[PDB]
Amino acid sequence: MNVFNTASDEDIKKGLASDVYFERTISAIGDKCNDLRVAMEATVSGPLDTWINFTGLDEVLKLLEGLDVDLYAIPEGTILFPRDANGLPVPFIRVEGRYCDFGMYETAILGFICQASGISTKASKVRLAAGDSPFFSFGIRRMHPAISPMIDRSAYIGGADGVSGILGAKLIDQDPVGTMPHALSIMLGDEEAWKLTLENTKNGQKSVLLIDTYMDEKFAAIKIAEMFDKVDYIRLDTPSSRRGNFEALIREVRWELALRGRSDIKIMVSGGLDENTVKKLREAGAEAFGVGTSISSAKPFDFAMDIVEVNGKPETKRGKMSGRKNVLRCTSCHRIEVVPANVQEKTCICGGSMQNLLVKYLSHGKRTSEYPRPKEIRSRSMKELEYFK
Amino acid sequence: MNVFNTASDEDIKKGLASDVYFERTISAIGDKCNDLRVAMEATVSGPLDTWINFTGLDEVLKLLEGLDVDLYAIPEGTILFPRDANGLPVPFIRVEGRYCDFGMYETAILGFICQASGISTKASKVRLAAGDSPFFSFGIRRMHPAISPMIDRSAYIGGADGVSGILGAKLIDQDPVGTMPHALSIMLGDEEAWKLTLENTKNGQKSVLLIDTYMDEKFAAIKIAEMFDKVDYIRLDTPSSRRGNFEALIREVRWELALRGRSDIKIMVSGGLDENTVKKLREAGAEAFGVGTSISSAKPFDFAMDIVEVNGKPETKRGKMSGRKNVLRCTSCHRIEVVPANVQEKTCICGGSMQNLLVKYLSHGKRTSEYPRPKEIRSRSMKELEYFK
Amino acid sequence: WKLTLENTKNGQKSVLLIDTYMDEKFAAIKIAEMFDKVDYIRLDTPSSRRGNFEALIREVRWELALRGRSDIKIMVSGGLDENTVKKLREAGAEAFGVGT
Amino acid sequence: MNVFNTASDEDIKKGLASDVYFERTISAIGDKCNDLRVAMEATVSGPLDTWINFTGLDEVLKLLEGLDVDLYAIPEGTILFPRDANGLPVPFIRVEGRYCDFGMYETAILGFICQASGISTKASKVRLAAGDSPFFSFGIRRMHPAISPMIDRSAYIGGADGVSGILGAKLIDQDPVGTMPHALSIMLGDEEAWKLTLENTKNGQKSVLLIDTYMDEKFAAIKIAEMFDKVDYIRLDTPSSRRGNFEALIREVRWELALRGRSDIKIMVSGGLDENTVKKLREAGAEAFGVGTSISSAKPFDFAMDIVEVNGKPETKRGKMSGRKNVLRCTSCHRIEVVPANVQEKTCICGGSMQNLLVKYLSHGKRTSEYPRPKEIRSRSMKELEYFK
Numbered sequence A, B, D: 001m002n003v004f005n006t007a008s009d010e011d012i013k014k015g016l017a018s019d020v021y022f023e024r025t026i027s028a029i030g031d032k033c034n035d036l037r038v039a040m041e042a043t044v045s046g047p048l049d050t051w052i053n054f055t056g057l058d059e060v061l062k063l064l065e066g067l068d069v070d071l072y073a074i075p076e077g078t079i080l081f082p083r084d085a086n087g088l089p090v091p092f093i094r095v096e097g098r099y100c101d102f103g104m105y106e107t108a109i110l111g112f113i114c115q116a117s118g119i120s121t122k123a124s125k126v127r128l129a130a131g132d133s134p135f136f137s138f139g140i141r142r143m144h145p146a147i148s149p150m151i152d153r154s155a156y157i158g159g160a161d162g163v164s165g166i167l168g169a170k171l172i173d174q175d176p177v178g179t180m181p182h183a184l185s186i187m188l189g190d191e192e193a194w195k196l197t198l199e200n201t202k203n204g205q206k207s208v209l210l211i212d213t214y215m216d217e218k219f220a221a222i223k224i225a226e227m228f229d230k231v232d233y234i235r236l237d238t239p240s241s242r243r244g245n246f247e248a249l250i251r252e253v254r255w256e257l258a259l260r261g262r263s264d265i266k267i268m269v270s271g272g273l274d275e276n277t278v279k280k281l282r283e284a285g286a287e288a289f290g291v292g293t294s295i296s297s298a299k300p301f302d303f304a305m306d307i308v309e310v311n312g313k314p315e316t317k318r319g320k321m322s323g324r325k326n327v328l329r330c331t332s333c334h335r336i337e338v339v340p341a342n343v344q345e346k347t348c349i350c351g352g353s354m355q356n357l358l359v360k361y362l363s364h365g366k367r368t369s370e371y372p373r374p375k376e377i378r379s380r381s382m383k384e385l386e387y388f389k
Numbered sequence C: 001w002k003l004t005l006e007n008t009k010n011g012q013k014s015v016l017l018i019d020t021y022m023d024e025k026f027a028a029i030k031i032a033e034m035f036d037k038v039d040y041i042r043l044d045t046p047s048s049r050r051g052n053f054e055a056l057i058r059e060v061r062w063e064l065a066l067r068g069r070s071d072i073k074i075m076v077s078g079g080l081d082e083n084t085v086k087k088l089r090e091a092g093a094e095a096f097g098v099g100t
């Protein structure tokens, strides 16, 4: 109950950020609440035609910490498919305890991993397409500001080299990235805007000039070459109506610059980009990318949380598989097999042994380890992404 | 800088929930900041093959209130296309003042109207498809909890009769909606779960029994008919793997019940529904719908904010149209024409006059009127939706 | 443009090719504030620059009207069909150059 | 200004075969005409999803010869893509001189290389499909007679073994090809027509009998086998309405003939054929092909001519790349790189060096060499086609 239409940390920790049916149900359970011990696993019902970059667990731990519950989960930054080598739904997190003790957090728990995972996953796809070239997350403006930090966080972990959001950058412990806007050229004109921008580019940072405000990207690039020398990048946000063939335009520009002996001036692009768009433009000559919407508004994975066991006995509903289970992965080929919890390791043909990926993060509500910082996590994520081409 | 990865009301009001390039630019503008008066209009670059249910302005006013800026906008709950009768981009909100005075809020302003509008718009499409039958917003679990209230808000305004979120319901001033979950049947069994659920259904509320936990929807429905009498609804969340032909199953169930003289038992459905899904199931016999994901994770409209005027003179970049402008609509056929601000009304062939829709909400940072409550807004929205079949 | 206007004769309408160097939009504004008796503005916009020709024509027509020059008609050419011509005429074009 | 609606050699040399805007413009340039030295290169805007067999330069030289202009160009019969290994538009001909001196010839210059190149290119595709079997150009009847010779010329150079046009054949210095028409059978009947045709087949030429006039190709073939002995070919122009499955019919015919010990009688086909049609029929058993329309009316490449330099300084418009340039090709793999004129050779990975393909054909209006005859050119063309499967 704050200024904007949002739930505060307090609200979500109090369980006010959830569906009423939960508390109403717990209430209905009454005295029986004490003798109701369950284990619930979270699986992906959502898109199965893609792998996923798991992200958002950090938020889950911050919420369940303190409650008398054991919590297992796959570490953020891991990349794998929603179904194992044999089509078994893979459980990303498991929670054990009194149903009534944490049941009202289903809503929040899902929310913390659904949207985030979609975001980190899209960034990963974009990462693969950007290759050795850098791309940055510029999409918070597309979503509610209240969640601007988690977006950049997942984007970063997903593979984004940098991030534009102030708070998101703070969260990942990196300096925000940002270039002069069109606004500047509209108010002061290109010449004065570029001068101001070059004069104000500081530290170990590269100068970048926005050139599609008024002129034709081609002639704007020439004008800049003959007007300034120390300019690292030329950024193009070319209006879609002007974007007849972006690839061709980038080439035209690159040739014109080389002709004037300025092949040193790199080219950056932004505005409505994908893994697809990014890949084709990088092949055209682009070396820096600004990616937003496609990542920030990435569709969320449809995670579901279900009781898979009741007071030690396997129990579920139709469409779900009962029993607590582990997620074994080949330390070599990364083959994955979902198995019953009473199986820790297994022999993986080709490579070696399959060890469990599901790690215990909470024990009786207490953190079993120190949670990794974002940079550490995206570090894992990139090694992880290496296995997907 | 709070517990979860979110920006607090304080953070966003301080402008910490934005791209660094803004402050960095303002800073670069320096002394010139005082003599830089601009007017920026917000237009939809996003999906143009659809109309839109504008929503989120409330958040914008709560943010800009206090600043020396005049603000015009189309009222939330209005429904129209992103381009006028002649393909001119329609401006949904206009802001006038010193660029440096509010420039850092571009990020937040967009975020407040992009995601929300997508949500309210999808709910509207779902509304049209539900007809006289009720549908509720059950999708917050799919997104970050921090924004669970704004989601239900837009969903409600979009046409949802009810909402499941606790905070969202508080915000719209309506009681949250919710039915017994599968969890209850897994822990206590159907028989005991249905009894508990019927015993705990109170007030002017209708009883609803979740029947797809263990049995076949068909036989579960029969068992319920011969077991209880006062049961208003039968809810089916049938697992997709069991959903061979949902329509056919609903019919099978409805016939079986009628045969046993229980045609009074209505049928509710939920789980992966659209305007499409909802329409076909309503034709099959469903009378109540639970809709989530499709609405809560609805793609956002790609709003852009651009300077359209500088110190009284028309000014913009390529791909944008300069000058402050009004949005005139036929009070009859609702034909829309974007025109230069110096045109208040116009004659609309067929019907009568075209009046301006862009209303001044803030004058020098002060609210020019009392903002409508959600119910009032969705009331407008439904009259508005009436014009679209 | 000066040469072209100076050499337009007889019962003929002046037409200025504006997509050589600038952005059609700003080139149109520059022309409005620079010359008065100009009957047409011709756009042969390179395909690589033709992201959405229809939208560009509109942008241009609005900009000109804003400056009270709605009298300046718009002509188009370059890779046109019955299809292309029909959609551009609906966008605002009033003269077409059709070849290939 | 002659009998038919055509421009005579005189008319085109006088520049009457062009758009008025040229002379009108030159005139407008006036006194400035003397100090306007430009270099214009011709590039393909046209179809880029295919390689091209350049043809028509011969006509260009015959027109520009005499004028004070230097002219470089890729030799006719060369085959390559419109864009180099890196997507740079490839210039096929360059002209240097006073703009006013030759500017009015843009129209004609393009016309000479646009239509022709399309024709030679299609013939090349047909060549590849005909394999070691011969195909002839029979399509002049589809286009205006005034240009019947240039059509056969390009068709020949493209790979056609022979040509039907009288003048075109004269131009390539080969005897025209031609078989008895249906007309003969309609006027005299098959029996008398075939006799006449066999009696009048002379020199080192093969007898060919048109058999689809009256009978069923199958029985007509049998009748011919048992009626004549020295018959080299059986030609089928089967009406499309009778062409249920041409491939199957050819087989039926070939079997019937073999059964009667006449497998020596080869089969020729014609009428609405492509690279596709030709390939499938050759696999069915056809050994000779008559191809017209598809080649004679082949779509033209959309060549454009643009000033790429003005008085020694690089200059162009948007969408074009400035500066005079060379077209380097790997003498091995035939990799192509468009480069600035000040680069003659380059090292081509894999194979060896890349030499320039753009050759100087005119120097101050004077031929720098003796132009190759058609046969010589198509000889080059076939070696050239060898690199494309």
Ligand SMILES: O=P(O)(O)OC[C@H]1C[C@H](OP(=O)(O)OP(=O)(O)O)[C@H](O)[C@@H]1O
Pocket: A138, A139, A142, A237, A238, A239, A240, A241, A270, A271, A272, A273, A290, A291, A292, A293, A294, B045, B046, B302, B304, B319
């Ligand atoms: O999140 P980003 O990747 O930065 O892009 C978000 C918007 C903006 C950009 O268009 P605009 O520049 O707003 O205009 P237009 O659609 O005309 O190209 C792009 O086409 C997307 O629709």
Ligand SMILES: O=P(O)(O)OC[C@H]1C[C@H](OP(=O)(O)OP(=O)(O)O)[C@H](O)[C@@H]1O
Pocket: A045, A046, A302, A304, A319, B138, B139, B142, B237, B238, B239, B240, B241, B270, B271, B272, B273, B290, B291, B292, B293, B294
């Ligand atoms: O937001 P909602 O409309 O409620 O639905 C969100 C999820 C859940 C439901 O599937 P599950 O019941 O989780 O399982 P399954 O996919 O197997 O049907 C549906 O198919 C969507 O994927």
Ligand SMILES: O=P(O)(O)OC[C@H]1C[C@H](OP(=O)(O)OP(=O)(O)O)[C@H](O)[C@@H]1O
Pocket: C044, C045, C046, C047, C048, C077, C078, C079, C080, C097, C098, C099, C100, D045, D046, D302, D304, D319
């Ligand atoms: O016969 P017309 O209708 O006049 O047009 C013929 C060519 C030229 C024009 O392109 P260019 O201006 O040559 O270049 P681009 O293809 O890059 O647009 C058009 O796209 C056609 O391909």
Ligand SMILES: O=P(O)(O)OC[C@H]1C[C@H](OP(=O)(O)OP(=O)(O)O)[C@H](O)[C@@H]1O
Pocket: D138, D139, D142, D237, D238, D239, D240, D241, D270, D271, D272, D273, D290, D291, D292, D293, D294
């Ligand atoms: O240039 P050519 O390859 O020789 O073909 C040109 C025409 C003639 C032939 O049909 P006809 O024999 O005129 O009649 P039909 O279409 O009925 O087969 C073929 O189908 C093409 O349409």
